[PDB]
């Protein structure tokens, strides 16, 4: 029941992200931050460069 605006988008910025600062609900809300800002961990040495 969140339609109202089937979501209008225009490219550039992060169309997933924006959903984060959007609606509220915790379960839903953690997914967003964990997925959105989820990246790779840049790691060096591993028993030699």
């Amino acid at each position: 029941g969140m339609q109202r605006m089937h979501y209008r988008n225009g490219d550039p910025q992060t169309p997933f992200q924006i959903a984060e600062q959007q609606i509220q609900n915790f379960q839903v809300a953690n997914w967003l931050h964990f997925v959105n800002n989820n990246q790779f961990r840049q790691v060096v040495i591993d028993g030699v460069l």
Partner: protein
Amino acid sequence: MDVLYSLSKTLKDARDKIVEGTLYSNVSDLIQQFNQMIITMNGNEFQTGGIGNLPIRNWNFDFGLLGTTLLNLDANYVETARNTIDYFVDFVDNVCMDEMVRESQRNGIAPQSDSLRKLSGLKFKRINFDNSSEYIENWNLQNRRQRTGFTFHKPNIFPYSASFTLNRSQPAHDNLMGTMWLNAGSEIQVAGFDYSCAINAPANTQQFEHIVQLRRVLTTATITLLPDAERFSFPRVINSADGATTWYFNPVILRPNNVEVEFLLNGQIINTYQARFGTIIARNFDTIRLSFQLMRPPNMTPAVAALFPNAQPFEHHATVGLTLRIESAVCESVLADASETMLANVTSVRQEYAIPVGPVFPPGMNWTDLITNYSPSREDNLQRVFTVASIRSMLVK
């Protein structure tokens, strides 16, 4: 406690950064924080007041959120918001005031009200933010355990004290020797008088001394020290020590000789200044000791010689003095000073609502009484109460 704080910088950085015009990307990081709050709230019932002439109002919530769409803020957006803030304003006021009255004794440094005891709850912690308000900055560092600190202008460290000590006196009070002073706020004035002008004194010099013990250590103090005590440079009729009669003081002022100011900490001299008038720094001290002398002038013109005869009656009373003012300093404990409104806010809210005298604070939050017996309980309560006053002043002045 920390909870409370946010609730405000929330509103200020709100009722301020949210006006007809600005683009959305000026508050995106803000809007969010805000909403988060609303949620946590709605559903929880509160109650405030009850003591003295303080109303008892009930609060309920189920307020809507805020559109995170519109690019530019249209007037219509504001008003539908201000109307929702004005319930939190009129709320917080009634909240601060409620916990700005109760006092404990032991563990009286913590929350008391049925309003706040529920705030420290865990489910509410989801609000903290931007703790750049000098006071909260210091509340935290203390909770954990660290070296706190505040900034004061003309601090209020000296309980009012205006008196004298006669080191040599007699019933007629016609040949006295002693000191009289006024310690109040951030200032000390002290005069040493010798009716005989040291006529029979060794080296024709009379030594004087004035010691003032602070109830709290002051650090990084900028101090003005000047010769002479204007307050004790005029003719006076004073009550005798026993209150049975009155004596006459008719001063004539001479420069204080061998002036030495010592700022001590636990009996140790931390700073010492010899005859240095003007601006001096006392970096850490709990005691001030002023020593000065009256030296009979070795050479006197006739007019001067006439004031100081070899025999009584002594009609012109030789007087030397000093004036010391603490312009600014840092204290690890909260204190009243000449710029902050904390003491006045707390005292004013209590007076306006006819709050009954409690077990911790002296009647009327009397500063002299408070600083004279500045117990740990009074300090913890004062800090709690001052921190709340500062949270309140971010929104209501």
